From a paper:
The 14-3-3σ protein, which has multiple interacting partners with specific peptidic motifs, was used as a case study. We have observed this phenomenon first-hand with human 14-3-3σ, a protein which has several hundred known interacting partners in the cell. For example, the 14-3-3σ isoform (but not other isoforms) specifically targets p53 and is associated with tumour suppression, making it invaluable to determine crystal structures of the target peptide with the correct isoform.
To address this problem, we present a combined co-crystallization and peptide-soaking approach to obtain crystals for any 14-3-3σ–peptide complex that may exhibit difficulties when crystallizing under our optimized ‘sigma’ conditions. The second step involves, after these 14-3-3σ–cJun-pS227 crystals are fully grown, displacement of the c-Jun peptide via addition of the desired peptide for the final structure at high concentration to the crystal drop and incubation for a period of time until full occupancy of the peptide is achieved. We have found useful criteria to be using the peptide at >95% purity and performing the soaking at 277 K with an incubation time of one week. To demonstrate the experimental reliability of the method, we considered this approach for peptides found in the PDB where co-crystal structures were published with isoforms of 14-3-3 other than the sigma isoform, since they were not able to crystallize under the standard ‘sigma’ conditions or any of the other hundreds of screening conditions tested. The new strategy that we present here has allowed the determination of several new structures of 14-3-3σ which had not previously been possible, illustrating the ease and success of the method. All models were determined to belong to the orthorhombic space group C2221 using Zanuda. In addition, the method retains the robust, stable, high-resolution and well diffracting features of crystals originally grown in the sigma screen.
Author numbering:
A (entry chain A), C (entry chain A): -4 to 231
B (entry chain P), D (entry chain P): 508 to 514
The structure:
């Protein structure tokens, strides 16, 4: 590891600087180095890891979608053949995206999930595992796709089971997990009714628990509830 | 496309 | 060169795809590979080269400014010492930025400028040479800085001399060159009066030539004239 | 900061 010679605290400090500078590839490399020190991550450090890789893979996903759309138009009837370049470059970006997802999944497997005993950490990491298998599923097309989809579903389901037993229905990790599992159902698993049902039940159970929250917690929970509502508006 | 959880 | 096995036309095609996908590092690598085929660049290809490296170095410059500002605040009176991490990370980004500038300057020197005989190509490349020495000057602090500044000035001056002899005062390359030389004077060379004088004379000479232009050329020229005016408003 | 030439 190229970060093996840097102090854990220095890696965390530099991840925060990289976030401020919008240098998300650097941020992800610093947080990978911090994970590889072998100690568990605090709440703040888990957030830094998630922010870093979310931004890296988010740029890759946006680029892959642009290139996939160009490629699909090139394969429509009446399109003049442009050679292999669109496919090759889409494949290049796709392979890079898959590499980032595999890197994240490898960190979760070695050994973040197995050492995560508290609900807040274990649910966070299992949600991440579902998310990065979902990003793999977005580009999967072989006999690969069904197994990747099942891996995403399995991680999300384990996270859901823990979150329902151990967290209040307004907990932002629980809410973001349910949001992302509903997106999995709608966009990946061809299960829009399950997506709508999960988003509705999640929203309603959180609404009924808002009265227990402080002003700051209320703001955190309602932000994610609004995304559930925004999706329900798009889906219904 | 659907909205997923932010940072 | 990692692009040595790819066809020149395929590199250009992929640069255009990378632009559409906002993958500017890829775009720059493709255009570097195209330059290294050894043939001169067309007008469109020069623009692709410029767009690619402008976006790469633009992100580096923005990041360097964020980190330099944090570092300067850490060195103000009353700031608690945070260790070497801010300086180290600013230095990392700075070195990467300098590497990109050196790469561009190397392409111009091997052998784009020497083969550029038409005014439109030679002025374009000399402006680029001034620009990337200007970006080096933005971060320079040693006994290095004076020589880097002189190198930027020399390239801009040669470009100006050719542009005034060979192009109309509304030519967008000539206008963008004069704009960037005025920025050099204001921001790098501590010569705000020279910056203001150059921006004013450039604007007024272009205004007097707009009557010769088509609607489309008029739009191209007035876009850059507005930037001259915007700077004059900030500077006066 | 001053504006420079765009693409
Ligand atoms: Cl490629
Ligand atoms: Cl560093
Ligand atoms: Mg240590
Ligand atoms: Mg593939
Ligand atoms: Mg139904
Ligand atoms: Mg050939
Ligand atoms: Mg230095
Ligand atoms: Mg004066």
């Amino acid at each position: 590891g190229a970060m093996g010679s840097m102090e854990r605290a220095s890696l965390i400090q530099k991840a925060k600087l990289a976030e401020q500078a919008e240098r998300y590839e650097d941020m992800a490399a610093f947080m990978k180095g911090a994970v590889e020190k072998g100690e568990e991550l605090s709440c703040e450090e888990r957030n830094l890891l998630s922010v870093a890789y979310k931004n890296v893979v988010g740029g890759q996903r946006a680029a892959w979608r642009v290139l996939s759309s160009i490629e699909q138009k090139s394969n429509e009837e009446g399109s003049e053949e442009k050679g292999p370049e669109v496919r090759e470059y889409r494949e290049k970006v796709e392979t890079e995206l898959q590499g980032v997802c595999d890197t994240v999944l490898g960190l979760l497997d070695s050994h973040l999930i197995k050492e995560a005993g508290d609900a807040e950490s274990r649910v966070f990491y299992l949600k991440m595992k579902g998310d990065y298998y979902r990003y793999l599923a977005e580009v999967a097309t072989g006999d690969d796709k069904k197994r990747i989809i099942d891996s995403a579903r399995s991680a999300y389901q384990e996270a859901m089971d823990i979150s329902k037993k151990e967290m209040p229905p307004t907990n932002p990790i629980r809410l973001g997990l349910a949001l992302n599992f509903s997106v999995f159902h709608y966009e990946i698993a061809n299960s829009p009714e399950e997506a709508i049902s999960l988003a509705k039940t999640t929203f309603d159970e959180a609404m009924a628990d808002l009265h227990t929250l402080s002003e700051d917690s209320y703001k955190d929970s309602t932000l994610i509830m609004q995304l559930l509502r925004d999706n329900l508006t798009l889906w219904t | 496309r659907s909205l997923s959880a932010p940072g």
